[PDB]
Amino acid sequence: DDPIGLFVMRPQDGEVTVGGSITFSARVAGKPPVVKWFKGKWVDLSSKVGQHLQLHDSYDRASKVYLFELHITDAQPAFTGSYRCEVSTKDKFDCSNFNLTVHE
């Protein structure tokens, strides 16, 4: 099938109500791997961090899996769009596509 990256679990499409919070996550299998989040093909989410968007990373020793989370709060119309999650590893590079929808 398709080539294997370190995302054991790819991010999933999410639905969120007005003024709420939504969490998206990606798992990486086992230095720590670097994770980038994108809006569209060439727009980086990390440079868009503020009240509306937050980034957080967590590590689970038992499964040797790193949990990467994208936090979106008080979501607005302007944030509706396609988001791409890219994870880089010591020997390989991989990416995934997911969408954020906010209405009302």
Binding site: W42, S47, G50, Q51, H52, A78
Partner: protein
């Protein structure tokens, strides 16, 4: 027409191209309710922007969106920009190109994100980022020389010859009017008066703008300050309390001349101007000294030019006569350069287009302009 906005510490200047005086001048501050309020009838208004904040200054915890020419929080800036285009200006971003002014050796993120917000949040066909030293030069009307730019933010020096540039020769100086205000508040504490609040921080700055003046010589007045008759004046606060100052007010502007009071290794403004000239070639040095231009928020006090002229003439070679030009309303001179710069037809072709940003990326700012 065109829109020119000055951004970068303490104040936001908003206006229209074709005017030598902007429509909207207000501080770049955002106020949030420090204390929770338990009352009925208030809209709560959890967000204050502009001069409204100045009136409700005590309860509100003021936060500056821009620190040292760098913006800490991007959405606060958006509110400021929104406020300038819609409330005082009463104009649409769609209608005209927007000009922004930026200091030299400033970090890449400020140019890239600022353009990114203008391209994405405020949709416009094109925008351009200009540098204060070049605009002042055009205002001056000279194509060759060295420009000393000291104002809100960071003091910078940028020599130019016949339009060719010398990046190595450009020097950045960590002095500013805002820095003097911090010095001033620090100096007040020894006298028994303490200001540790952002709200009252402005009040000392207000004092500095009209009460402070430049002495012919710092050391002689300070010496004569032991018995101060006419060196002390009474200032009235909104509070109604009375403040009296003496040698304290004239020693504030002095710090630019003598950074040792601030606690920094770097030499004062006259030594730095000299250093910039030394880097440049001897052949072009001769018109550099006679073409010194002063502009900015902290250059307002009379006599600065007279002190600079004698200090530069003494330290510098006697080969060439030293001429310094410092005209009134120099505080808004940088903004003025921007409004005139946008006016020229040739300049309009030069603006960084939205199409270009999306096709190549934020990294093309350096590529398009020096």
């Amino acid at each position: 027409a065109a829109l020119v906005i000055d951004n970068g510490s303490g104040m936001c200047k908003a206006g229209f191209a074709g005017d030598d005086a902007p429509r909207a001048v207000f501080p770049s501050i955002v106020g949030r309710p420090r204390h929770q309020g338990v009352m009925v009838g208030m809209g709560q208004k959890d967000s204050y922007v502009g001069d409204e904040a100045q009136s409700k200054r005590g309860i509100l915890t003021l936060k500056y969106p821009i620190e040292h020419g760098i913006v800490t929080n991007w959405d606060d800036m958006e509110k400021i920009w929104h406020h300038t285009f819609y409330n005082e200006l009463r104009v649409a971003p769609e209608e005209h190109p927007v000009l922004l002014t930026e200091a030299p050796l400033n970090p890449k993120a400020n140019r890239e994100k600022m353009t990114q917000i203008m391209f994405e949040t405020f949709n416009t066909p094109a925008m351009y980022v200009a540098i204060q030293a070049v605009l002042s030069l055009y205002a001056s009307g000279r194509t060759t020389g060295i420009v000393m730019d000291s104002g809100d933010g960071v003091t910078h020096t940028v020599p130019i010859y016949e339009g060719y540039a010398l990046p190595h020769a450009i020097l950045r100086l960590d002095l500013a009017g805002r820095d003097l205000t911090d010095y001033l508040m620090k100096i007040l504490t020894e006298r028994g008066y303490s200001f540790t609040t952002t709200a009252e921080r402005e009040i000392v700055r207000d004092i500095k703008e009209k009460l402070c003046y430049v002495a012919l010589d710092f050391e002689q007045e300070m010496a004569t300050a032991a018995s101060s008759s006419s060196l002390e004046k009474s200032y009235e606060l909104p509070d109604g309390q009375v403040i009296t100052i003496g040698n304290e007010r004239f020693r504030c502007p002095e710090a630019l001349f003598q950074p040792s009071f601030l606690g920094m290794e770097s030499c004062g403004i006259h030594e730095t101007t000299f250093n910039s000239i030394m880097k440049c070639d001897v052949d072009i040095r001769k018109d550099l000294y006679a073409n010194t231009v002063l502009s900015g928020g902290t250059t307002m006090y009379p006599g600065i030019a007279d002190r600079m002229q004698k200090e530069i003439t003494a330290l510098a070679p006697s080969t060439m006569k030293i001429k310094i030009i410092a005209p009134p309303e120099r505080k808004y001179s940088v903004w003025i350069g921007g409004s005139i710069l946008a006016s020229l037809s040739t300049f309009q072709q030069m603006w960084i287009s939205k199409q270009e940003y999306d096709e190549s990326g934020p990294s093309i700012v350096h590529r398009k302009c020096f």
